[PDB]
Design a protein around this ligand. Structure first.
Ligand SMILES: O=c1ccn([C@H]2C[C@H](O)[C@@H](COP(=O)(O)O)O2)c(=O)[nH]1
Ligand SMILES: O=c1ccn([C@H]2C[C@H](O)[C@@H](COP(=O)(O)O)O2)c(=O)[nH]1
Ligand SMILES: O=c1ccn([C@H]2C[C@H](O)[C@@H](COP(=O)(O)O)O2)c(=O)[nH]1
Ligand SMILES: [Cl-]
Lengths: 124, 125, 124
């Protein structure tokens, strides 16, 4: 079944997929931000979605931004989350990093996971 | 399908918990008291060992509350065959000292499904 | 079917798993590098791969290097990537970090993923 998503405002851009072999789906900033060196900023996408079962969405770095010193903080979108997906951009570069509305900021990867029951034992 | 067995190596260990039925993984807690200066990192002991599930690894993943305070996760690959005590590398990239108290939630362990292909060298792909 | 790989030069080393229960395949530097503190470097492995289906390769940290302050930037090797696999090593230690040709620098994890359809809705 398809993954449903909602645009909170008209400023949101629907996540995009360019090729059959891409790991993920492009995420875009819904707002203008400026991030000083050595600081981080939560970037709102204005996109909420119903994640697939036995999966989480990993907010993953674009390589081009990573080479510029821009890293991703947090980034775990659980299947229970119905809120605004936020990208924590960390400016580990030396200059101010500017984020404009519509800028590609990360890629969302639907990562397959397991939910085992945990059982405490005396020894393994 | 079958349960993942785990051991509390001391009485200070807290059983990893599911936050909600659709949470990504299992919350880990500090078994000891630490102070992490700004621009430093610390291996935080959980005193938890597990018999990890097959064809997965445990990713030590950040909780966003800590990430927004500048606390990031180093390392974080828990191999399927690892039988030792699980450690969480907390990196204080914030401006102030970060305090970790015994029992504090520090990360979420995600059982990520993986593939072990055979690798074969070729002249051309 | 096995993952086919090519050595771009004879400086490349074949990725291997340490043990039958290891999450990742060892990646090695094909060249010498020097990384200043608070900087990063794209490290060439000189290995290219025909990546497996419904997977991406995550460039993941080795714990020893992580404890020394060396972190991984970027790290998403898409299914469709047929180029030289690069490792972005970030030196978050306090001293200059030396990379010698042949050094183990990271691990590649073949992470299982989904490529779902996306559908915009009014409400989740
Ligand atoms: O980088 C992130 C990390 C998390 N979340 C969402 C998903 C979670 O359900 C919620 C709370 O995150 P935690 O504090 O529980 O990690 O925020 C984001 O939007 N961006
Ligand atoms: O953040 C980490 C990283 C690794 N390990 C443990 C689990 C791994 O299987 C093992 C890897 O050890 P080395 O092979 O790097 O020595 O260490 C942790 O507890 N926490
Ligand atoms: O750490 C990294 C991140 C990416 N890549 C490769 C694989 C990706 O498919 C490609 C990304 O290229 P762009 O689409 O971002 O230009 O680069 C690496 O070799 N190492
Ligand atoms: Cl991951």
């Amino acid at each position: 079944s398809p993954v449903r998503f909602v645009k909170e405002t008209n400023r949101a851009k629907s996540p995009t997929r360019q090729s059959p072999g891409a790991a993920g789906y492009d995420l875009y900033s819904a707002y203008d931000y400026t991030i000083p060196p050595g600081e981080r900023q939560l970037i709102k996408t204005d996109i909420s979605m119903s994640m697939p079962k036995f999966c989480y969405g990993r907010i993953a770095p674009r390589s081009g931004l990573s080479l510029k010193g821009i890293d991703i903080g947090g980034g775990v979108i659980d299947e229970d989350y119905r809120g605004n997906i936020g990208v924590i951009l960390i400016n580990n570069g030396k200059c101010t990093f500017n984020v404009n509305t519509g800028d590609r900021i990360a890629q969302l990867i639907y990562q397959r996971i397991y939910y085992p029951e945990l059982e405490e034992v005396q020894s393994l």
